[PDB]
């Protein structure tokens, strides 16, 4: 039956197998989760220094790469820049923190991320109980958790040399999940994407964003970009 031209719902090649991506849901510990709820809906003046929290683990991230290279040099031979990228994305009302860093196991986000209690929690309770600056929690093992200063919901996605890659995913409320990523390949690092609160939408804003990097993370030792998308 001659054909001298093709239609392009006709030629539309068959899709890839589905992909299953199996999923696992834990509690947050105990002391893990009370923190959260209290920095969730408490009202803190300076939550601008969830950056900082942030910035700080990826630059602990890729000082690991410089020191993993003593016990297995073979990650001399990555070809990739040893960087931080901020990307605030307007559109979707994200702020991604991405990172080349030696990246999380799925054990590592579960154990890391939500299920270990930290031994500096309750005393980090009881000194925001009485009235210490949301900026000490650097100094009290839980840093990351300043995330939810800003964001609604946080998705952690993470690629490390020994595993596969793997998205992490919390808007709180007592539970995390962990999941297997199919998708969008990173290689090996890890990204942060803070799904902001409505009111905070001032970290999307690149002039807030530089002044915050000034005043907060000026000894990162890694080069840190941030990349702005052009105003139409
Ligand atoms: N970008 C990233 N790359 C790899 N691991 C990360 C990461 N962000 C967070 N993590 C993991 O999450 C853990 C929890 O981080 P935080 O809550 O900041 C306490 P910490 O950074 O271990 O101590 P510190 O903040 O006192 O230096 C880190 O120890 C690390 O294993
Ligand atoms: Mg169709
Ligand atoms: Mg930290």
């Not at 960087?83 to 080349?100: A, E, G």
């Not at 270990?116 to 958790?145: N, R």
Request: net charge negative; proline share 3%.
């Amino acid at each position: 039956v001659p054909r001298g031209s093709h239609m392009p719902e006709e030629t539309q090649t068959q899709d890839q197998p589905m992909e299953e991506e199996e999923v696992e849901t834990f509690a947050f510990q105990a002391e893990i989760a009370q923190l959260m709820s209290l920095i969730i809906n408490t009202f803190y003046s300076n939550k601008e220094i969830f950056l900082r929290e942030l910035i700080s683990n990826s630059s602990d991230a890729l000082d690991k790469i410089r020191y993993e290279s003593l016990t297995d040099p073979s990650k001399l031979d990555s070809g990739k820049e040893l960087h931080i990228n901020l990307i605030p994305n307007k559109q979707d009302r994200t702020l991604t923190i991405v990172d080349t860093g030696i990246g999380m196991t799925k054990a590592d986000l579960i154990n890391n991320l939500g299920t270990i209690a930290a031994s500096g929690t309750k005393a980090f309770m009881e000194a925001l109980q009485a009235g210490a600056d949301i900026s000490m929690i650097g100094q009290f093992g839980v840093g990351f958790y300043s995330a939810y200063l800003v964001a609604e919901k946080v998705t952690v996605i993470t690629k490390h040399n020994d595993d596969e890659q793997y998205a992490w995913e919390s808007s709180a409320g007592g539970s995390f999940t962990v999941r297997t990523d199919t998708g969008e390949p990173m290689g090996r690092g890890t990204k942060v994407i803070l799904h902001l609160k409505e009111d905070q939408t001032e970290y999307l804003e690149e002039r807030r964003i530089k002044e915050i990097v000034k005043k907060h993370s000026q000894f990162i030792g890694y080069p840190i970009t941030l990349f702005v998308e052009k105003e139409r």
